[PDB]
C-alpha cells in the first residue's frame, strides 16, 4: 500500500529553522512529483512546495518562498521541507502529499507549533464521582504545552465508551479532558486509570481514577 | 490566484440521502477540480480528480461532477462513515487552492445528554486549585447550554469548555465544561451545580454536589 509519514513538527520559535521529512513507501517514490500542504488551526488548506519527480523542479506559493525549501533523496526514498524565519501564522498541521492527479496521497500530518510560549508538562487529575448501571469517570489533562498529548484507558486495554475531548488553549496553556463510561460492577471493583502521554515533556503518566 | 468558495460550509442530512457538496472558482477552471475528504481524526484522501474520476480504493458512492466555474461532490446514498468535512481544490494555475470545506453532519433521531460532574480532585486541592468538570455525553442535536452555578449563582468566568466532533458509530456529539477556581474561592461556596439545556428535556437536566457531603 501507498504510505508516507511525516515527521519533525514540534514547537519552534518565532525566527527559527525546522527541517520536516517524510518517509514514502509503496510506490516508486522517483516516479512522482511530490508535495507540501499544510492546514491551519481554524482548518484551512494551504498548498506549500512543490518538487518534481527527479528534483530538479521546485514551486512555491508567495507565502513562503524564499523561507522554506523542498528536497528529496530518491534513493532513501525521502521529501524534506526545511523552514526558515518562521512566523507564527506558519502554525499548521504540515501534510506530504504524492502529486498524481490531485493530492493523491497524503501522510497523517505533522504538528509544527510556532510560539513564544514555553514547553510545560501537564497536570494530570483523577475525575471520581449515587449509582447506576453504568458510571463515568474521567482524567483532567490541565496547563500543558504545546500539543499534542495522547490519553488512553488502562493502557488501552479500555476503548469502549471513551470520549477524548480537543484541547482548548488559554493564556498559552492548554487543557483537556477525557472521559470513560463502564459498568458499575466494574469499578470500582476493577481498577481504571488514565495513561497520559506529552512527546514535548518526555512525559507519560499514569493516574488511578480512586474512589 | 484562483479562489474556490464552498457557499455551503456544513450541511445536515439523513442516512440513505443522496448529498450534494457544491464549488465555485472565481474563474473558469476548465475541469481542474479535485475533491478531498477529511476525517474529525484528520485524515485526509483523495476522492475524486479531474472533476470526475474516482481515485484508486474510494467507495462508488463518491462521485464528481462540472464545468466551467461550478462543481459538485455527490453521495449516492449517505452512510455512516460519510462524517467528515468535503474540500474541494482546483489544479487550473499555480498556486493550487483549496476551497474553505463543507462538514457533513449525519442527522439522527434525538438523544438525551448523559450529565456527569466532578468535584476537585484532592491532589489539586493540596497543590492549590479547584478545577470542577461537568461531561454531557451522546446527545443530538448538538445545540446545547451549560450553565454553572454556585450556592445558586450563575459563574463565567474561569470555564472551558470543549465539544467533541460527530461520533464516528453512534452519530452523538458529547461536551466537557470545566469550571476552575482557586482553592479559596471554592472553599467558600458549598453547592456547585452543572445545568444543561436540551431539547429533549422541558426542564434543564441538573447534576450537583455539596462540599458538605
Known amino acids: 500500500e501507498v504510505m508516507l509519514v511525516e515527521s519533525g513538527g514540534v514547537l519552534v520559535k518565532p525566527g527559527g529553522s525546522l527541517k520536516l521529512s517524510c518517509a514514502a513507501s509503496?510506490?516508486?517514490?522517483?516516479?512522482?512529483?511530490m508535495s507540501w500542504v499544510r492546514q491551519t488551526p481554524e482548518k484551512r488548506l494551504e498548498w506549500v512546495a512543490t518538487?518534481?519527480?527527479?528534483?530538479?523542479?521546485?514551486y512555491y506559493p508567495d507565502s513562503v518562498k524564499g523561507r522554506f525549501t523542498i528536497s528529496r533523496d530518491n534513493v532513501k526514498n525521502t521529501l524534506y521541507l526545511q523552514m526558515s524565519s518562521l512566523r507564527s501564522e506558519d502554525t499548521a498541521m504540515y501534510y506530504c502529499?504524492?502529486?498524481?492527479?490531485?493530492?493523491?496521497?497524503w501522510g497523517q500530518g505533522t504538528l509544527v507549533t510556532v510560539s513564544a510560549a514555553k514547553t510545560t508538562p501537564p497536570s494530570v487529575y483523577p475525575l471520581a464521582p449515587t449509582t447506576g448501571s453504568s458510571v463515568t469517570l474521567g482524567c483532567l489533562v490541565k496547563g500543558y504545552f504545546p500539543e499534542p498529548v495522547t490519553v488512553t484507558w488502562n493502557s488501552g486495554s479500555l476503548s469502549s465508551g471513551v470520549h477524548t475531548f480537543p484541547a482548548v488553549l488559554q493564556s498559552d496553556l492548554y487543557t483537556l479532558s477525557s472521559s470513560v463510561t463502564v459498568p458499575s460492577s466494574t469499578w470500582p471493583s476493577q481498577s481504571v486509570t488514565c495513561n497520559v502521554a506529552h512527546p514535548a515533556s518526555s512525559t507519560k503518566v499514569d493516574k488511578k481514577i480512586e474512589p | 490566484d484562483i479562489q474556490m468558495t464552498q457557499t455551503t460550509s456544513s450541511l445536515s442530512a439523513s442516512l440513505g440521502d443522496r448529498v450534494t457538496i457544491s464549488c465555485r472558482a472565481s474563474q473558469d477552471i476548465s475541469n481542474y477540480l479535485n475533491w478531498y475528504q477529511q476525517k474529525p481524526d484528520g485524515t485526509v484522501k483523495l476522492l475524486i480528480y479531474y472533476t470526475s474520476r474516482l481515485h484508486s480504493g474510494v467507495t462508488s458512492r463518491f462521485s464528481g461532477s462540472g464545468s466551467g466555474t461550478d462543481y459538485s461532490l455527490t453521495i449516492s446514498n449517505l452512510e455512516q462513515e460519510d462524517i467528515a468535512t468535503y474540500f474541494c481544490q482546483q489544479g487550473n494555475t499555480l498556486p493550487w487552492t483549496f476551497g474553505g470545506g463543507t462538514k457533513v453532519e449525519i442527522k439522527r433521531a434525538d438523544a438525551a445528554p448523559t450529565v456527569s460532574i466532578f468535584p476537585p480532585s484532592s491532589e489539586q486541592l493540596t497543590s492549590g486549585g479547584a478545577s470542577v468538570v461537568c461531561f454531557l455525553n451522546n446527545f443530538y442535536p448538538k445545540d446545547i447550554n451549560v450553565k454553572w452555578k454556585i450556592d445558586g449563582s450563575e459563574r463565567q468566568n474561569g470555564v472551558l469548555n470543549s465539544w467533541t466532533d460527530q461520533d464516528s458509530k453512534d452519530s452523538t456529539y458529547s461536551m466537557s465544561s470545566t469550571l476552575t477556581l482557586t482553592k479559596d474561592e471554592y472553599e467558600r461556596h458549598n453547592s456547585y451545580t452543572c445545568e444543561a439545556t436540551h431539547k429533549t428535556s422541558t426542564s434543564p437536566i441538573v447534576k450537583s454536589f455539596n462540599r458538605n457531603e
Open positions: 509503496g510506490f516508486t517514490f522517483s516516479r512522482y512529483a
Open positions: 502529499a504524492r502529486d498524481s492527479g490531485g493530492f493523491a496521497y
Open positions: 518538487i518534481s519527480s527527479g528534483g530538479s523542479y521546485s
